[PDB]
Amino acid sequence: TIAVTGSIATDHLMRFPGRFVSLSFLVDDLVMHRGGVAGNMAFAIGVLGGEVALVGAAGADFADYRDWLKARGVNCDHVLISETAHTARFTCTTDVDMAQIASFYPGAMSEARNIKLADVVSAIGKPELVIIGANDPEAMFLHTEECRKLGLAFAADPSQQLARLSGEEIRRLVNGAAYLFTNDYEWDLLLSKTGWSEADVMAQIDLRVTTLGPKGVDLVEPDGTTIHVGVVPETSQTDPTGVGDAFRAGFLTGRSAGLGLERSAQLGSLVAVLVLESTGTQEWQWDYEAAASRLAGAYGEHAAAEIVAVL
Amino acid sequence: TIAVTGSIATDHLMRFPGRFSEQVSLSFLVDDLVMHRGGVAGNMAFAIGVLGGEVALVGAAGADFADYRDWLKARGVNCDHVLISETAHTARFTCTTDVDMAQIASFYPGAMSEARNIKLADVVSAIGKPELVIIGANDPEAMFLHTEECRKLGLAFAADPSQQLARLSGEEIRRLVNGAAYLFTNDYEWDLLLSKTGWSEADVMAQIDLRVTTLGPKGVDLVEPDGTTIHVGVVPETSQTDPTGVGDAFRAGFLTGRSAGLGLERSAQLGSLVAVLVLESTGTQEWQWDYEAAASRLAGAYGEHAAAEIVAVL
Ligand SMILES: NC(=O)c1cn([C@@H]2O[C@H](CO)[C@@H](O)[C@H]2O)c2ncnc(N)c12
Ligand SMILES: NC(=O)c1cn([C@@H]2O[C@H](CO)[C@@H](O)[C@H]2O)c2ncnc(N)c12
Numbered sequence: 001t002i003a004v005t006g007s008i009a010t011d012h013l014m015r016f017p018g019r020f021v022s023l024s025f026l027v028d029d030l031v032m033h034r035g036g037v038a039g040n041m042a043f044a045i046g047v048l049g050g051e052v053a054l055v056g057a058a059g060a061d062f063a064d065y066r067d068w069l070k071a072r073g074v075n076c077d078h079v080l081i082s083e084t085a086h087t088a089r090f091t092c093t094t095d096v097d098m099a100q101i102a103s104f105y106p107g108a109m110s111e112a113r114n115i116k117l118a119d120v121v122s123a124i125g126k127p128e129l130v131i132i133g134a135n136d137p138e139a140m141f142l143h144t145e146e147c148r149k150l151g152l153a154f155a156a157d158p159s160q161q162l163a164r165l166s167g168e169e170i171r172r173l174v175n176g177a178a179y180l181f182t183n184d185y186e187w188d189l190l191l192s193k194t195g196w197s198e199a200d201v202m203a204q205i206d207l208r209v210t211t212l213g214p215k216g217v218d219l220v221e222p223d224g225t226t227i228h229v230g231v232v233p234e235t236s237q238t239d240p241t242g243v244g245d246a247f248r249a250g251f252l253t254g255r256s257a258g259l260g261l262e263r264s265a266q267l268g269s270l271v272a273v274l275v276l277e278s279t280g281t282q283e284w285q286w287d288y289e290a291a292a293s294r295l296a297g298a299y300g301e302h303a304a305a306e307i308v309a310v311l
Numbered sequence: 312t313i314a315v316t317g318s319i320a321t322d323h324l325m326r327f328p329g330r331f332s333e334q335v336s337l338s339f340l341v342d343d344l345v346m347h348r349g350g351v352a353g354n355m356a357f358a359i360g361v362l363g364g365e366v367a368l369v370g371a372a373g374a375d376f377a378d379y380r381d382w383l384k385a386r387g388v389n390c391d392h393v394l395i396s397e398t399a400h401t402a403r404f405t406c407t408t409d410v411d412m413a414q415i416a417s418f419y420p421g422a423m424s425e426a427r428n429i430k431l432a433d434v435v436s437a438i439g440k441p442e443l444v445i446i447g448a449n450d451p452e453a454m455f456l457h458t459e460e461c462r463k464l465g466l467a468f469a470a471d472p473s474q475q476l477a478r479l480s481g482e483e484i485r486r487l488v489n490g491a492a493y494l495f496t497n498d499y500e501w502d503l504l505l506s507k508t509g510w511s512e513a514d515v516m517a518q519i520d521l522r523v524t525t526l527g528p529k530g531v532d533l534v535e536p537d538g539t540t541i542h543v544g545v546v547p548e549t550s551q552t553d554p555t556g557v558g559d560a561f562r563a564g565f566l567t568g569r570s571a572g573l574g575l576e577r578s579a580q581l582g583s584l585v586a587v588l589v590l591e592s593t594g595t596q597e598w599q600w601d602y603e604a605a606a607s608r609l610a611g612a613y614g615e616h617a618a619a620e621i622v623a624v625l
């Protein structure tokens with residue numbers, strides 16, 4: 001079972017038909033969707049048939065979201081429901097170039113620091129992997145300390161909170177990680193803020209995964225072995241929100257089904273492009289045949305057959 | 312009766328405890344998020360009603376408007392002529408304000424776009440000819456059609472395009488100005504209006520009865536076509552919090568003063584008071600009217616005579 005920690009949110013997503021003080025953008029689309037990094041990854045892992053538990057804090061409004069997730073197989077037992085605060089809110093405007101200007105209001109997310117992974121362990125067993133996703137900062141640290149304490153394997157996934165964290169806090173999130181997930185800009189920011197070199201980082205983790213936007217993804221091992229996977233090319237780009245989360249979910253679902261690194265990253269790339277081609281982060285659909293087809297088109301029929309075999 | 316046309320909205324207002332000046336992929340971690348009644352026509356109707364004026368709100372909202380409607384009617388606002396869309400939701404304004412009161416916002420029109428289906432002749436028939444029609448930021452075609460109708464039916468109007476000025480072409484702007492009893496803008500909007508229209512300052516003043524140009528912390532200018540200029544400094548703030556709706560508040564206070572028979576300077580002084588009260592609250596309609604506090608801050612800024620004269624007509 002994969003335990004996903006991180007934000008649970010409502011995403012308010014708008015489209016500006018232009019290209020990015022007193023800035024006002026006239027937007028021509030406004031939709032509200034289920035969101036949060038842990039929401040998104042738990043949803044995708046559940047849709048692809050993995051065993052997954054969502055671990056984070058939401059508000060009393062979470063009931064409908066809860067049903068949505070449970071219908072896809074997500075265990076939400078260990079979602080903390082705040083007595084007073086509302087579920088976090090992400091407000092984002094995306095332009096023609098897929099550039100984005102956003103605000104994030106934590107709300108109930110800040111109470112995630114009150115969750116003890118020991119309860120989840122006691123309730124479902126030791127997880128195969130804990131994803132330490134963008135969350136209340138103290139929660140991210142405490143979750144990581146607990147994984148180290150209880151000997152749980154974890155993925156450091158501090159994407160959107162990296163800008164908000166100090167160098168020392170980042171360094172405390174990385175050591176011992178089975179995986180480090182970031183995008184290339186975040187990778188450079190992590191090196192800068194931590195002062196670590198590339199080699200210093202790779203000495204502390206089992207694998208670095210660096211997404212590269214349209215240039216795909218690198219999976220880098222501490223001995224320098226590098227797998228580069230190009231994207232599943234898009235046909236109808238619409239909103240980039242949640243593409244990183246989808247990639248991580250697909251990749252980790254593939255790993256949990258026993259696929260190798262390259263095959264797992266190819267599955268991740270497929271889920272990523274499906275989210276890119278949807279507005280909300282959890283609005284994509286899983287279609288076995290469409291999946292087989294686009295995997296084959298990008299990566300070859302053998303790769304596609306192997307991937308769809310484990311789903 | 313003052314007829315207020317323009318946007319009706321829900322405002323989603325957030326505070327960034329930083330500076331946008333310091334900043335493709337911008338994310339602001341905000342420490343406040345509140346949802347409030349909004350839209351320029353909503354805001355000006357609300358303020359005019361709170362100050363005791365006769366006012367009708369004329370614009371388009373969604374089926375969710377019922378609570379808002381009650382809110383406005385309890386303050387004296389006639390909402391009979393709000394058009395409720397069968398399908399669209401009330402417009403949504405989403406705004407993040409930084410420490411310096413700078414702002415980054417998105418506006419989703421929704422039902423606002425149906426305002427072009429409103430005919431001021433119906434409102435005239437139902438309440439009589441308005442004393443003044445405020446042509447506030449709205450669906451662009453609605454702004455044009457409302458202005459054409461005011462000219463047709465001989466209604467006195469205020470050109471108040473503010474936030475839509477950036478979205479309108481020069482020709483559309485020129486069509487909104489001619490014949491206006493008032494032109495309201497801020498100083499940046501005034502420069503943009505001259506640029507996009509190509510008009511000179513004199514070309515504009517030849518077509519309107521009065522220019523009102525707000526200047527942020529530098530107060531407001533009221534300029535007549537013969538160059539007569541009244542400068543009114545602000546009521547100085549004590550607790551700056553969110554600038555949303557400060558312009559609407561000033562316009563409401565000023566026009567309520569004019570409707571109560573005050574002169575230009577006294578009306579602008581009342582406007583300045585309502586403006587600072589909104590500056591000092593988060594939502595645009597969250598301010599409170601306190602007779603004594605009003606008298607006091609008017610006197611502090613403008614002198615005891617001005618304050619007594621203003622509070623007399625309220
Ligand atoms: N841009 C931000 O600051 C954030 C956006 N999200 C979520 O990240 C998801 C996309 O990965 C969206 O569904 C959002 O809810 C966040 N989650 C946690 N912390 C944050 N600072 C953000
Ligand atoms: N920034 C924008 O583009 C707009 C903001 N508002 C409203 O303007 C009010 C403040 O004057 C707020 O209550 C908003 O609902 C608007 N109303 C009409 N048109 C617009 N383009 C805007």
Ligand code: NA
Nearest residue numbers: 239241275279
């Ligand atoms: Na998306």
Ligand code: NA
Nearest residue numbers: 553589592593
């Ligand atoms: Na305000």
